[PDB]
C-alpha positions as a LaTeX table, in Angstrom:
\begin{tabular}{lrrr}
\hline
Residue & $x$ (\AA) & $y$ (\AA) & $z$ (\AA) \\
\hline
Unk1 & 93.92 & 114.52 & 89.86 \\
Unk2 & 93.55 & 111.83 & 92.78 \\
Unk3 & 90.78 & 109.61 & 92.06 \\
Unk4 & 89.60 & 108.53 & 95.44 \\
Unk5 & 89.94 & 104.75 & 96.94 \\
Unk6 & 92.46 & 102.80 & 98.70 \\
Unk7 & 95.48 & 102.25 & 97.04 \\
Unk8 & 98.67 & 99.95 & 98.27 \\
Unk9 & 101.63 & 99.29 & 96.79 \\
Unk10 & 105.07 & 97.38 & 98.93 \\
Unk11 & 107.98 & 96.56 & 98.00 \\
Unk12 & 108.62 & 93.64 & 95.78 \\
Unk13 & 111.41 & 92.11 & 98.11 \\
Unk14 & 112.65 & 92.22 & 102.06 \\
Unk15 & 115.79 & 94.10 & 102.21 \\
Unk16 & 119.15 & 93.00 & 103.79 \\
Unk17 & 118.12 & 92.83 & 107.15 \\
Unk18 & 114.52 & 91.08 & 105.87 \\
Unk19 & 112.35 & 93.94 & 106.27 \\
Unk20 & 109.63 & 94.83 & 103.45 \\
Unk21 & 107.73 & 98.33 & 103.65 \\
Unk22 & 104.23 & 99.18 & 103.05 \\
Unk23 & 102.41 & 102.48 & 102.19 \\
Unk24 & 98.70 & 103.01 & 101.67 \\
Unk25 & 96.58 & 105.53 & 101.54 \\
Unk26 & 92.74 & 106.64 & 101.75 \\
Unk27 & 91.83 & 109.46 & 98.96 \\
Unk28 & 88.47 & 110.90 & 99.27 \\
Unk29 & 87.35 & 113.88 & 97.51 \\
Unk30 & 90.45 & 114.00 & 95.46 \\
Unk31 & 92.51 & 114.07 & 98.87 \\
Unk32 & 94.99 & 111.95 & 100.71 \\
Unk33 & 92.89 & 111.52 & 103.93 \\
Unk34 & 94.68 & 108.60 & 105.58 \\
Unk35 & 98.57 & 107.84 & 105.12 \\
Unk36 & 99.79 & 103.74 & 106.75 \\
Unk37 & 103.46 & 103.08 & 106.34 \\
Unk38 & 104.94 & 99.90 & 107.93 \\
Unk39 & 108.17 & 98.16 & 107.72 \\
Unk40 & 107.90 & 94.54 & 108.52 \\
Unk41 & 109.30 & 91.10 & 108.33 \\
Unk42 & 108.52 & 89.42 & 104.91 \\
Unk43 & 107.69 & 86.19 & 106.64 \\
Unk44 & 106.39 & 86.70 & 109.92 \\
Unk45 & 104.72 & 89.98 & 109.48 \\
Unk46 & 106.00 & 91.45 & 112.51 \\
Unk47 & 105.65 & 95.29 & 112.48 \\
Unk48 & 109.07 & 97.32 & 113.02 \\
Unk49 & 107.23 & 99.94 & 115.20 \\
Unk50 & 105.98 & 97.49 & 117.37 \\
Unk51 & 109.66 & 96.13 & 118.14 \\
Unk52 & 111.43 & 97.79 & 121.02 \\
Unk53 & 114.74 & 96.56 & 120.88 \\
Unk54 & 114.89 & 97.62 & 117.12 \\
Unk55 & 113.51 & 101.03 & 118.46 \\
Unk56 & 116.17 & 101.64 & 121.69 \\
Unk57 & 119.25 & 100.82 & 119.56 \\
Unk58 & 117.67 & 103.10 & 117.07 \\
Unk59 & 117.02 & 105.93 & 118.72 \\
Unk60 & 120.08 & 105.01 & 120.59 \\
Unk61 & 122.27 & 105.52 & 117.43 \\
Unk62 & 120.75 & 108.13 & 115.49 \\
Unk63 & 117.99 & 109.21 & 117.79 \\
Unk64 & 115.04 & 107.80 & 115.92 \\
Unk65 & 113.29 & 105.11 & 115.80 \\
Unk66 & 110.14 & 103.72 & 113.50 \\
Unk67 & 107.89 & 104.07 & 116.37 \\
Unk68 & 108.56 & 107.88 & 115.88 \\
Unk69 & 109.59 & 108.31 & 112.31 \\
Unk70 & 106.55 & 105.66 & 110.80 \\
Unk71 & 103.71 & 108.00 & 111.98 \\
Unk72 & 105.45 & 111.17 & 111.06 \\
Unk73 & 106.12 & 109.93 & 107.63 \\
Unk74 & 102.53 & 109.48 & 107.23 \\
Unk75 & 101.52 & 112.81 & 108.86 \\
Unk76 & 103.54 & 114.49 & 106.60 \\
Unk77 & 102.31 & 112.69 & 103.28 \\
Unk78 & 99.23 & 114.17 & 104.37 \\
Unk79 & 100.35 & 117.83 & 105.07 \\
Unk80 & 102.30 & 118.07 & 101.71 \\
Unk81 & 99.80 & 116.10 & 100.18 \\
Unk82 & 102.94 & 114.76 & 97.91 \\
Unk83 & 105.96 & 112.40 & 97.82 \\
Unk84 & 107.78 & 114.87 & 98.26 \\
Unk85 & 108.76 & 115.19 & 101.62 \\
Unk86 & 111.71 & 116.50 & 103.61 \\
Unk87 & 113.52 & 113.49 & 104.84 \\
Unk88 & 113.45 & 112.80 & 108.57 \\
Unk89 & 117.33 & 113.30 & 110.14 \\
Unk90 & 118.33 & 110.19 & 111.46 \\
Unk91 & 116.00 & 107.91 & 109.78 \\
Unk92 & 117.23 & 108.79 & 106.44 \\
Unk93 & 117.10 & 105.65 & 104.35 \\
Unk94 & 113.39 & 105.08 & 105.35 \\
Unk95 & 112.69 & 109.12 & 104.53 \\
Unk96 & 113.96 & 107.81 & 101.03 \\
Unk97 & 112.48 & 104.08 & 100.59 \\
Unk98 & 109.08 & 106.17 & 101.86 \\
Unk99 & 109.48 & 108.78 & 99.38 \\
Unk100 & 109.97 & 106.22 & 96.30 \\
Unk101 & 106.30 & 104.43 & 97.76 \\
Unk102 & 104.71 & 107.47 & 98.11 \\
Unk103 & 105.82 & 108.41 & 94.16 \\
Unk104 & 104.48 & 104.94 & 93.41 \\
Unk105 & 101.26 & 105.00 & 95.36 \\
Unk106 & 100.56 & 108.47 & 94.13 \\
Unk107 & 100.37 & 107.87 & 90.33 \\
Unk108 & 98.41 & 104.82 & 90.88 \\
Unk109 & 95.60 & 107.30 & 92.33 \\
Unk110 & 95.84 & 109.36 & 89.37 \\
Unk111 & 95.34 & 106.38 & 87.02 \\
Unk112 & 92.84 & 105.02 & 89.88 \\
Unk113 & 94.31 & 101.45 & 89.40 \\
Unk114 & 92.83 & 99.25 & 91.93 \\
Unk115 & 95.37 & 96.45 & 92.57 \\
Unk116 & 97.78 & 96.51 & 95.01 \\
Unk117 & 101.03 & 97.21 & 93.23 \\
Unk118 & 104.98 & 95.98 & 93.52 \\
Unk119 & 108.28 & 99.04 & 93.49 \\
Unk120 & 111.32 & 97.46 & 93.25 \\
Unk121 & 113.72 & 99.67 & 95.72 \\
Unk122 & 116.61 & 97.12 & 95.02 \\
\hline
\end{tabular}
């Protein structure tokens, strides 16, 4: 049982390349309704989506960038209505780190705990 509201949660520290990641979510009528995932600097706040050299090398490499895998991440939150997603080829570290989030986000609905909440990936 989702109780509805917004719930947050981020991760407690930037990772090696100074990126932190945030989901949140909208649940209304016991349903995930809206789904925001970001990876962004710790300190300046710049959004990883919104970079486009990040994104070129990226899809470059492995063929996807967060400008594509961000939004589908979310759409797919919604769709399963879960954490438990299929992870996104290419953009597999961010399938995961999204996944743990999601876990994390997800049982604070259930509990309906209001406060924006810490998950320590490292």
């Amino acid at each position: 049982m989702l109780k509805d509201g917004d719930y947050t949660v981020e991760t407690a520290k930037a990772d090696d390349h100074g990126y932190k990641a945030k989901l949140s979510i909208k649940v209304s009528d016991g349903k995930i309704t809206e789904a925001k995932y970001n990876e962004f600097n710790g300190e300046t706040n710049a959004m990883k989506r919104e970079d486009k050299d990040y994104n070129e090398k990226m899809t470059g490499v492995s063929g996807i960038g967060p400008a594509e895998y961000e939004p589908q991440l979310e759409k797919a939150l919604i769709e399963k209505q879960s954490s438990d997603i299929d992870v996104i080829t290419g953009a597999t570290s961010s399938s995961n780190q999204f996944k743990k989030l999601a876990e994390k986000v997800l049982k604070n609905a259930e509990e309906g705990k209001t406060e924006a909440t810490l998950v320590d990936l490292e």
